[PDB]
Amino acid sequence: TVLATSRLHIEGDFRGYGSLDKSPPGALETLNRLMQNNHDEFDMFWRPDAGHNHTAFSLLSVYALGGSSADLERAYRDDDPHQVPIGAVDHSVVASLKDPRIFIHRMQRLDQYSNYLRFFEERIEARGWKAVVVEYLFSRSDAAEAMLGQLFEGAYHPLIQLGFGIEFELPGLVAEGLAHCAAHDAANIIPFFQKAEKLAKSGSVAPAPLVELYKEVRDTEKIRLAAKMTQGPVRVRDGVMGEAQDDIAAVAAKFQVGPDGLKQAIIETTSCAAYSCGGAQRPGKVAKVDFFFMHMVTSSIFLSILARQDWLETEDKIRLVEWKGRLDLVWYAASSAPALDRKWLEQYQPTLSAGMDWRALYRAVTVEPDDGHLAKIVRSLKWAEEEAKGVETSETIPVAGSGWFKLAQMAYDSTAHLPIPAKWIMGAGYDFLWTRVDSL
Numbered sequence: 001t002v003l004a005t006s007r008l009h010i011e012g013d014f015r016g017y018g019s020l021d022k023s024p025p026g027a028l029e030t031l032n033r034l035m036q037n038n039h040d041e042f043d044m045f046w047r048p049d050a051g052h053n054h055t056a057f058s059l060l061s062v063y064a065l066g067g068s069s070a071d072l073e074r075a076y077r078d079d080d081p082h083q084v085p086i087g088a089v090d091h092s093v094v095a096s097l098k099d100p101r102i103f104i105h106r107m108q109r110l111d112q113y114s115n116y117l118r119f120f121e122e123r124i125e126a127r128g129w130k131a132v133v134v135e136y137l138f139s140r141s142d143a144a145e146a147m148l149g150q151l152f153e154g155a156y157h158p159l160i161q162l163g164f165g166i167e168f169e170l171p172g173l174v175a176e177g178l179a180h181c182a183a184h185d186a187a188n189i190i191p192f193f194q195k196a197e198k199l200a201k202s203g204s205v206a207p208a209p210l211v212e213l214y215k216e217v218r219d220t221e222k223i224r225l226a227a228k229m230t231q232g233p234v235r236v237r238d239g240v241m242g243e244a245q246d247d248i249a250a251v252a253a254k255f256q257v258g259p260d261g262l263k264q265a266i267i268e269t270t271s272c273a274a275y276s277c278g279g280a281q282r283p284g285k286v287a288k289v290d291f292f293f294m295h296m297v298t299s300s301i302f303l304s305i306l307a308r309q310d311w312l313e314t315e316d317k318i319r320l321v322e323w324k325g326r327l328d329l330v331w332y333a334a335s336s337a338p339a340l341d342r343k344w345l346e347q348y349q350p351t352l353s354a355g356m357d358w359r360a361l362y363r364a365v366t367v368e369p370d371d372g373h374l375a376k377i378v379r380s381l382k383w384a385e386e387e388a389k390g391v392e393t394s395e396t397i398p399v400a401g402s403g404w405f406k407l408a409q410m411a412y413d414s415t416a417h418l419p420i421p422a423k424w425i426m427g428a429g430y431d432f433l434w435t436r437v438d439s440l
């Protein structure tokens with residue numbers, strides 16, 4: 001039977017966090033047609049490692065930046081390589097997923113995406129998306145505890161997809177995100193999250209500023225060297241978690257948010273992620289933004305969005321930000337914990353984006369051939385400027401003020417007019433990766 005939940009209709013004025021210019025007429029109709037095509041025709045996974053379908057991310061971000069029909073069509077065509085036929089649904093498997101032990105049991109299998117999608121669509125059709133999200137992520141059942149770890153998998157893709165669903169209140173997109181969450185292959189980050197949290201709640205770990213926990217990861221050789229350059233997409237599973245799970249778990253336990261600390265913890269995690277991106281530069285090299293640090297920033301807007309949901313307890317909002325901050329330390333370690341310096345973003349001189357404001361940068365991003373990350377990072381950075389309105393740089397907040405837009409300029413300048421593989425450096429701490437980066 002056709003579910004109402006399967007129909008993605010964005011309607012009304014809402015155009016997204018950090019939006020500036022309204023998309024011109026005709027864009028909304030293009031957005032709905034293409035989001036619906038992507039939803040019905042394509043899987044969430046097009047290859048085993050780094051194979052997340054970005055189509056929904058690229059469309060919704062280009063809409064938020066005020067792109068027209070033609071820009072959304074570019075976004076869709078640019079992600080053609082992301083778009084493979086959606087898996088056949090097994091309807092007896094879908095019926096069985098009502099049992100929480102069969103649910104848990106089939107988790108972390110990529111070929112299950114379509115089964116979990118149909119399941120979550122049926123469940124949302126019956127209870128609505130708010131009820132289902134609390135039930136499957138935040139209710140501390142066994143299923144929900146495993147789904148919460150899964151939410152951060154793949155450098156934050158499930159969180160990002162669920163985040164988009166919640167931001168635009170799209171039931172079918174919330175369903176895609178939950179299904180993505182359930183099906184994502186495991187990087188052995190769940191025990192990192194359990195160990196760090198058990199340590200944090202023990203009463204015997206004093207909290208420290210996140211910026212000092214980045215420093216400790218870099219300065220602890222066993223953690224810094226756990227990841228290997230040529231492990232590529234499995235650095236976290238086979239390197240950071242393989243060699244140093246307990247060690248990084250004891251560091252991450254020091255990141256602890258008090259009951260009145262939610263907004264500052266979002267600003268703290270977002271500032272340190274932006275600081276990763278902008279501060280991991282090398283003398284004599286052009287500016288490049290690390291691909292992983294870029295996901296640490298692109299994911300950050302969705303923390304801000306979950307933080308503002310009426311249907312979610314403040315305890316559950318604080319937990320989300322704790323876990324994201326902690327895993328940002330793992331992604332830092334996975335890029336070989338490069339030396340960070342505030343001087344690079346402070347001193348950065350824009351090139352292609354020199355003299356633009358946010359409105360002109362947004363316009364330039366809407367037309368730029370890209371898989372969606374450029375649009376995602378400039379929007380998270382404009383939003384970060386709003387979230388952290390009035391906050392200045394300090395010992396704990398390393399990027400603020402004009403730094404947010406300066407990073408956006410560096411992401412545009414260092415990425416525009418390049419093929420996708422040349423855009424983002426795949427681990428800023430690995431010296432060899434800089435031999436393939438232009439000198440000054």
Ligand SMILES: [Fe+3]
Nearest residue numbers: 052054295373
């Ligand atoms: Fe991505």
